[PDB]
Design a protein around this ligand. Structure first.
Ligand SMILES: CCCCCCCC/C=C/CCCCCCCC(=O)OC[C@H](O)CO
Ligand SMILES: CCCCCCCC/C=C/CCCCCCCC(=O)OC[C@H](O)CO
Ligand SMILES: CCCCCCCC/C=C\CCCCCCCC(=O)OC[C@H](O)CO
Ligand SMILES: CCCCCCCC/C=C\CCCCCCCC(=O)OC[C@H](O)CO
Ligand SMILES: [K+]
Lengths: 30, 30, 33
C-alpha cells in the first residue's frame, strides 16, 4: 500500500475517531 | 500490510472505536 | 517494496486504541462540566 493511502488512513482515523466519540456521546443525550 | 490486511484493520478498528466510546460513557454514568 | 515492521504496526494499532480511549474520556469529562 502507498504512503499516500496511509496518510489518508491515519488522518482519516483521527477525524473519524473524534466524530464517532462525539456522535456516540450525543446519541446518549437523546 | 496488504490492501486486504489494511481493510481488516480499518473495519475492526472502527467497530472497536464505536464500542470503546460506548463503554466509556456507559461506565461513566454508573 | 517497503515492507512495514510487525512490531511498529502492532505498536501503532495499540496506540490508536489508547488514543481512542483518551478521546472518549476527554469527551466524557468535558461533557459533564
Ligand atoms: C466486522 C466486525 C469486526 C470486529 C472485530 C474486532 C477486532 C478489534 C480489533 C481491531 C484492531 C484492528 C484489527 C482488526 C482485525 C479484525 C478483522 C480482521 O481480521 O480482518 C481480516 C482482514 O481481512 C485480513 O487481515
Ligand atoms: C469478535 C469481536 C467482537 C467485538 C466485540 C468486542 C467488544 C469488546 C468490548 C467493548 C466494550 C463495549 C461494552 C458495551 C457497553 C455496554 C453499554 C450498554 O449495554 O448500554 C447501552 C447504552 O449505554 C444504553 O443506551
Ligand atoms: C494513527 C494512530 C495514532 C496513534 C497515536 C498514539 C500516540 C502517539 C504515538 C505515536 C503517533 C505516531 C504514529 C502514527 C503516525 C506515524 C505513522 C505515519 O506517519 O504514517 C504516515 C506514513 O508516512 C504514510 O504517509
Ligand atoms: C474517512 C476515512 C476514514 C479512514 C479510517 C481509518 C481507520 C484506520 C484504523 C486504525 C488506524 C491505524 C492505521 C494503521 C495503518 C497505518 C500505520 C502503518 O502501518 O504505518 C507503519 C509505517 O511503518 C509508518 O509509516
Ligand atoms: K480509532
Amino acid at each position: 500500500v502507498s504512503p499516500g493511502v496511509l496518510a489518508g488512513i491515519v488522518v482519516g482515523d483521527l477525524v473519524l475517531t473524534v466524530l464517532i466519540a462525539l456522535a456516540v456521546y450525543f446519541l446518549g443525550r437523546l
